[PDB]
Each structure stands twice: as structure tokens, then as C-alpha cells.
């Protein structure tokens, strides 16, 4: 659970 | 309401500091969160409150409620998950 | 979110949106794995609704997206009306959502888990950005 | 209702009560013929709560009250959960309601019908009676 | 909540004098009614406005929102029947 | 429809 395929950028 | 899906990063706050704001409506099983220059709004109810742990986003609240006019100075109010956790992992146990 | 970023596509997975048999959204949800999603209980999601996986732009029609059937509704026992105490409500889904590079679970934390006032965190969806 | 009186028992026989499993009433509902209440749409009623009518004093536990189980719930698809605009939730019963000296319909209006500003009525119910 | 039903009488007002009030928060299915010292209130949502006419309780608005502190000097706001009558009068015919 | 067998007081 918890670590998208896709990172998110903040 | 915006077509793609937004984003924000925002601080979690003491339920106590909270109370400054919402006094008695503050609930053990909800957990506070912006008043930094975001605020969460109608139609993001339902939805997803984050924080990483550990390498993971995990869930850590559910946009509920606040401020009529999602004023970036008040703080929203979410549902708090370690709170309910107990209940949803049960919920799976017997479905 | 009044004042958000518009996020990267597919990069948090786990997002759901909840629309009627209109179209129209009017909540967001978080798989929790592949047959349950959990939203808020005042959202007062019915089984004429749906769960909608994989979205990205709400007006691109390109997309291969999910739109996931409701089974049964749970609306926590205790969630409390007249306060929105305890606004959680789990949804049990009628068809499987397909996992995959967009389509993925949020992790839940323990009743014990500790998360620290100060520390910063992250909220996404499709509500008023100016209201 | 802030600042309403007591009601006589069963001068409202449309009135119904809402109540989860937990007996916690969280709205009302109007009886529109026999299978049939109206009550909000905001009210997010699911098929685990329960309609009941021919109530009065929700304390008391000498009443033939009828403990009535939802079938299927009806969201008006216009209703705006963003605005809380078109607010109706249509609500079909399993079981059929016993019509009786405390258990009867309001009367619908005609979509024609005028009730101008000034207008003396009525609101009936089980909420907040100080806030 | 007290344990028995309450009642309250109170005055219809039009739309426009309530936009006073909510101002662009009342939509055309909306009705207004009460700031007469009586309010709506937390839990009467879902429940009945009725008026009389031609001898009968005829269903007028449904307890829907107002204020968050139940002030007996602003109006509730309901839901508007006339404009929602045409819906439930159809969903009782496929049913 | 609307007018109970048990009339209300006001
Ligand atoms: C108007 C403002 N305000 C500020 C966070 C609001 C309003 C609604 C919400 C959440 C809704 C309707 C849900 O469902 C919210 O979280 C905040
Ligand atoms: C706090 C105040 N306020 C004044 C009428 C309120 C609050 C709630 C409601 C209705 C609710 C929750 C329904 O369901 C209402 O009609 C008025």
C-alpha cells in the first residue's frame, strides 16, 4: 500500500 | 470545480490549538489540519488526507468539514483514522 | 483546495471520485485495496453512485478510467449527524478495481500510530478552488 | 426547534423518526402514503437505519410505535451536495406502514401550488431544542 | 434532542428578502421561513414544513440547513416540495 | 391525506 508507480512532486 | 486533480501540502495541528478556533465542535475522532495559506473545500469532502510513514502514505485523516467560505486562515477539520481504523479493520473481517 | 497545485497524473493512485448517475462528482473516496474504498459519511453516497478510478482530468474524455458500482453501503455506527463525529463510511464494491500503474491503495495506520502536530502533510481532490 | 412546545401525541401522524442501529435518531421524514417517506437528501440515509413512526416521546418504551426497514433510497439526481441545493431523498420501504389514528400522509402540493410570504405554518420534530 | 416531538408555527418569507440573509446561497428550490424566535435545528433536518390548505397539512418544505447555531432570528432553509413534487410524483410511478 | 385523526393544538 502507499508508494505510487507514479512519485508525486511537491 | 476544477476539471484535474489539485494538491496541497499543509501542517497537522494539536486538537487543543484546534479548539482555539472550532471551541467545543472538535471531537476526539477528528484531526485538524492547514490554516497555512490552503484550505480544503467543497467537494474534496470524502477524500484523502496523507502524511508519509515510514516510505508510505498512509492515511491519516478524511476531509470533513469547516469554514463556509474555505478560508486559508481556519484550519479543516478531518476525520481522524486512528480512531476508526479499529472499526474498518473489522468491517473487512466480517464481509 | 483553495490555493492547490494541480497534481502530476496517476500519482496518487488511490484517489476515487464519487458521481451520481449524473456524472456530476460531489465527493472524494480512497481505496483501501481492491474491493473497498472509504470516503466520509456525510457524503451520503447511495448505491446509485459510483467510484471512479484513475481519473486524472475530469473533462478529458481519452482516459482509461474505472467507473466502479457500489454493493453495499457502511456508515460507521457511531458517525454522529447532528456533530459529523465519526464521518466515515466504507464502501464494498460490486465489480473489483483493476490495480496498476494509476490504480492503487493508501495504507492505513495503526490505532497506535503517532502523527505529530507541525508535521506537514498532503491533501488532493476535485473541490472549489475559489469559492 | 428552538423555542417550539411539546406537540399532542399523534397530531403529527406523518412525522417519522430516522434512527441508525445504534437507536440514534439523526433526522426526520414525512409519510407520503403507505410505502413511501420523504426526507432529505443531505440526511445520507443507507439501508441499515430504519423509519420509525407513530412516535412521540423517544424515551418512553410503552408505545405501539412501528419500527419500519428502508428497501431502497432514492437521491433526487439534481440534489448539489455542494450547495445543498434540491434536497430530497425519496425513501422505499420494505416494509408497508399500518395507517391508523397516529399513523397517516401529509398531502403533497400541486407543482402549480402558490403558499405566499407572510404565510403562517408549521415544522415539527426531534432536534436541537437549545444548540 | 428531547425525547418527545416538538412544534413550532412560523412565517413563510419570499426568496428575495431571504437573499438578504444567505444571499447567493438560496437557489430557486429553496424556501424560506422562520427569524419569527423560533428555529430549525440539528436533527430536525429531513422532517416537515407544512402549511394548510383547503383543510389539510400539505407538504411544503423540508427541513434542509441554516445556521450553524440555530438563531431564532435568521430563517431556516428548506426544501422547496413545489419544484421537487414533479421527481417524487414520477419516481412513485416506476416503483 | 393530510388531516389527522388526532387534530393538533397551537
Ligand atoms: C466552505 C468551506 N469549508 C473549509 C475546509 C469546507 C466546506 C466543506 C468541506 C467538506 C464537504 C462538503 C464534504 O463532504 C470542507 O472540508 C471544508
Ligand atoms: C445550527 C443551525 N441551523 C438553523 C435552522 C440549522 C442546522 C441544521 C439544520 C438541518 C440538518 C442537519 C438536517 O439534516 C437546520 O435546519 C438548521
Given at each position: 500500500?502507499?508508494?505510487?508507480?507514479?512519485?508525486?512532486?511537491? | 470545480?476544477?476539471?484535474?486533480?489539485q494538491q496541497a501540502?499543509?501542517p497537522?495541528?494539536?486538537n487543543?490549538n484546534?479548539?482555539?478556533?472550532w471551541?467545543?465542535?472538535?471531537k476526539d475522532?477528528?484531526?485538524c489540519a492547514?490554516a497555512?495559506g490552503?484550505?480544503?473545500c467543497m467537494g474534496?469532502?470524502?477524500?484523502?488526507?496523507?502524511?508519509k510513514?515510514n516510505?508510505?502514505?498512509?492515511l491519516?485523516?478524511?476531509?470533513?468539514?469547516g469554514?463556509?467560505?474555505?478560508s486559508?486562515?481556519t484550519?479543516g477539520?478531518?476525520?481522524?483514522?486512528?480512531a476508526?481504523?479499529?472499526?474498518?479493520?473489522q468491517?473487512?473481517?466480517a464481509? | 483546495?483553495?490555493?492547490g497545485?494541480?497534481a502530476?497524473?496517476?500519482?496518487?493512485?488511490?484517489?476515487?471520485?464519487?458521481?451520481?448517475?449524473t456524472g456530476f462528482?460531489f465527493?472524494?473516496?480512497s481505496l483501501?485495496?481492491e474491493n473497498w474504498?472509504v470516503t466520509?459519511a456525510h457524503?451520503?453516497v447511495?448505491?446509485?453512485?459510483?467510484?471512479?478510478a484513475?481519473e486524472?482530468?475530469?473533462?478529458?474524455?481519452?482516459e482509461?478510467?474505472?467507473?466502479?458500482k457500489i454493493a453495499?453501503?457502511?456508515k460507521n455506527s457511531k458517525?454522529?449527524s447532528?456533530?459529523?463525529?465519526n464521518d466515515?463510511?466504507?464502501?464494498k464494491?460490486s465489480?473489483?478495481?483493476?490495480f496498476?500503474q494509476?490504480?492503487?491503495?493508501?495504507?492505513?495506520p495503526?490505532?497506535?500510530?503517532?502523527?505529530a502536530?507541525?508535521?506537514?502533510c498532503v491533501?488532493?481532490?476535485?473541490?472549489?478552488?475559489?469559492?
Open positions: 500500500c502507499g508508494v505510487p508507480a507514479i512519485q508525486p512532486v511537491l | 470545480t476544477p476539471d484535474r486533480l501540502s499543509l497537522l495541528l494539536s487543543t484546534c479548539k482555539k478556533y471551541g467545543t465542535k472538535i475522532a477528528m484531526i492547514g497555512s490552503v484550505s480544503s474534496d469532502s470524502g477524500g484523502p488526507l496523507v502524511c510513514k516510505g508510505a502514505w498512509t491519516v485523516g478524511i476531509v470533513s468539514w469554514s463556509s467560505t474555505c486559508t486562515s484550519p477539520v478531518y476525520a481522524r483514522v486512528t476508526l481504523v479499529n472499526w474498518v479493520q468491517t473487512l473481517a464481509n | 483546495i483553495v490555493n497545485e494541480e502530476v497524473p496517476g500519482s496518487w493512485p488511490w484517489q476515487v471520485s464519487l458521481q451520481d448517475k462528482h465527493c472524494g473516496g483501501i485495496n474504498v466520509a457524503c451520503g447511495t448505491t446509485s453512485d459510483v467510484v471512479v484513475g486524472f482530468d475530469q473533462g478529458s474524455s481519452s482509461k478510467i474505472q467507473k466502479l453495499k453501503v457502511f458517525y454522529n447532528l456533530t459529523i463525529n466515515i463510511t466504507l464502501l464494491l465489480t473489483a478495481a483493476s496498476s494509476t490504480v492503487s491503495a493508501v495504507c492505513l495503526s490505532a497506535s500510530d503517532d502523527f502536530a507541525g508535521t506537514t491533501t488532493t481532490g476535485w473541490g472549489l478552488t475559489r469559492y
